[PDB]
Amino acid sequence: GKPLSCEEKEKLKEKLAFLKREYSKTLARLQRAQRA
Amino acid sequence: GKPLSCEEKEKLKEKLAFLKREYSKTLARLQRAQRA
């Protein structure tokens, strides 16, 4: 981890990722709800 | 016409947007870690 400590670089990287996962979830409901 | 109440789909729709705005903020930070 040349840049920010690996513990940080990974924390930020993995974090941002898990974020994209939560975003989709929000849509999931909106998806079905709309189809309802 | 529309599933739940009108304000219901609005609150969620608007809320979801906020999430997207946050993401960008995150990416920015990282963009700096690589800036070097």
Swiss-Prot record, chains A, B:
Domain of life according to the entry? Eukaryota
Q: What is the effect of changing residue 30 to P?
A: Found in breast cancer patients; uncertain significance; abrogates the interaction with BRCA1; abrogates double-stranded DNA break-initiated homologous recombination; abrogates PALB2 and RAD51 localization to ionizing radiation-induced foci; may weaken homooligomerization
Give, from the UniProt record, the effect of changing residue 16 to A.
Answer: Loss of interaction with BRCA1 but no effect on interaction with BRCA2
Q: What is the effect of changing residue 30 to A?
A: Loss of interaction with BRCA1 but no effect on interaction with BRCA2
Described by its record, this protein's role is as follows: Plays a critical role in homologous recombination repair (HRR) through its ability to recruit BRCA2 and RAD51 to DNA breaks. Strongly stimulates the DNA strand-invasion activity of RAD51, stabilizes the nucleoprotein filament against a disruptive BRC3-BRC4 polypeptide and helps RAD51 to overcome the suppressive effect of replication protein A (RPA). Functionally cooperates with RAD51AP1 in promoting of D-loop formation by RAD51. Serves as the molecular scaffold in the formation of the BRCA1-PALB2-BRCA2 complex which is essential for homologous recombination.
Domain topic, free-text comment: Interaction with BRCA2 occurs through a hydrophobic pocket at the crossover between WD repeats 4 and 5.
Q: What is this protein called?
A: Partner and localizer of BRCA2
Which species does this protein come from?
Answer: Homo sapiens (Human)
The portion of the full protein included here is 6 to 41 of 1186
